[PDB]
Assembly symmetry: C2
Homo-oligomer: 94 residues x 2
Amino acid sequence: MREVVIVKSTPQRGKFNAFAELVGKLVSETRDFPGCLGAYLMLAPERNEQVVMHIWETPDALEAYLTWRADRGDFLEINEYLEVEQDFKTYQLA
Amino acid sequence: MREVVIVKSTPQRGKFNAFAELVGKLVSETRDFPGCLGAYLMLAPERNEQVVMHIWETPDALEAYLTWRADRGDFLEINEYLEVEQDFKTYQLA
């Protein structure tokens, strides 16, 4: 199986563009992780929503990525920018 | 700008796998529609959720697609398999 993650972020008031800059770098870091087949950043300023989607060659690769990023300062910096916890969902790629 | 659509579907109970077969054919049509840069079907049976994402060269191309599909029988067939209306959202691709 290939898996897909979709993560929806809701930035704090006044921080939409700053968060887009921050998360764009994190998306690049994700794109470069071994086994990531693609990563995309989606913006809807008028809805105060940013969505990241990434595709994984194996569940192995996804899980290695999630473990690797969990304690990293760069990924953890998102907490200073978001109003509520990210909505993180995993899917099977058909 | 490139644009991305994410559409979330909630199939009627007992119709998850039938819905996946029907929507898979629609995703294939979309994938090779003029201006489509990619189309993906995501399944989460345990959440009774299916998600389609597609990427568009231009907003013009997306809008031509939405107009083209609006009255087509195969796209309309989805409505008899849905528990609630689809959640359709458009984004700017960063």
